[PDB]
Each structure stands twice: as C-alpha cells, then as structure tokens.
Amino acid sequence: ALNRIKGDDELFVGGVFGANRARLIKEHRITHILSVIDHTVDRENEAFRHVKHLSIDIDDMEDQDILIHLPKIVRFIDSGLRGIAVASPGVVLVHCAMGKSRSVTAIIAYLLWKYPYRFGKSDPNISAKEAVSRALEWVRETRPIAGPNDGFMRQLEMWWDMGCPADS
C-alpha cells in the first residue's frame, strides 16, 4: 500500500512496487513523486505522464549521507503540497524500496521542519533523539514498518539540532 501520513497534509509513503502501480497513483490522486532511491517513472503510462518527479540516488545503509539532501527533499515535499499563477495544491508520494528507511527519513525531515512544536520544540529538556523518535512514532501510526537505519536516525538528529535549515 501507499499509506497516508497522519495529519492535514496529503502526503503518502510507500515502497517501490506500490509507487509503480498506476492504480494506486490514480486512487490517491498523487501529483508529485519523490523517489529517495534511484528511480524512473513510466511516462508512457497516462498515470505518470504528468507527475512531477525527483529521484535521489541513495542506498539504505548507515554510511550514506542523506543529511546533504534534506533541504532539497523538504522543499520538494512542501512546494508540491502547497502548489507553488494560482496555486494548485498537490498530493505528494515519497517512496523508496521498502517504504521503511529512506522514504521515512525524508518524511520525518519534513515533519520536523514543518511541525517542530508537535515533536517538542520547547519542552526545554527535549533532545534531538526524543524529537526524532516522536516523529518516527507519528509516521508509524499509518506506516507501522517505518524504521530508518541507525545512520539515518543520527542524521535526523543532526537535522533537528541544525534547526532544520531547508531554505536555499
């Protein structure tokens, strides 16, 4: 499945077999796909012909640098949701292979950047580890297999402690 993240955003997460299923793209009216994995959409299929696509080539390994990508990732998700000429808010799918580690890390980076007070921005003994954990448990409410690898978890803590700097 492609699961919808809890909250007010039309934001979805899943793995590669779901992200390739035209039927699911159409069911959820997905307009934007962020592949946190090397990926090419099938533009010969009407369901994908006009989707806005970004692919980042990264593996699901603890030594992979995903922090470097998080500003671009967050800007892609936010601009696809807000639709920025009249704005046309979109529906964003973030996927990887399993919908477990790479894509979930990207979603958590966006959630920490957009909703810092939800994840503790000032209980003053809020640690980065606790903020990231709360965002992971938020994702797990609709994507229970979610679980970034240990290196991605560390980098999400770096992201939080850097103040989630998504500006270009």
What domains lie within the chain, and their CATH numbers?
Answer: 1-168 (3.90.190.10)
The experimental resolution of this structure, in angstroms, equals 1.6
3-state secondary structure of 120: coil
Contact predicate 112/31, CB 8 Å: no
Any residues with CB less than 8 A from the CB of 31 and at least 6 apart, and which? 51, 52, 80, 90, 91, 92
Amino acid letter at 91? V
Solving technique:
X-ray
Q: What letter would DSSP give residue 111?
A: H
Q: What letter would DSSP give residue 5?
A: P
Spell out the alpha helix ranges (H) of the chain. 16-19, 22-28, 46-49, 70-82, 102-114, 128-140, 150-161
Which residues are part of the catalytic machinery? 96
Q: The tokens 């979603």 sit on which residue?
A: 107
Residues 23-40: b if buried by 16+ CB within 10 A, e if exposed? ebbeebebbbbbbbbebe
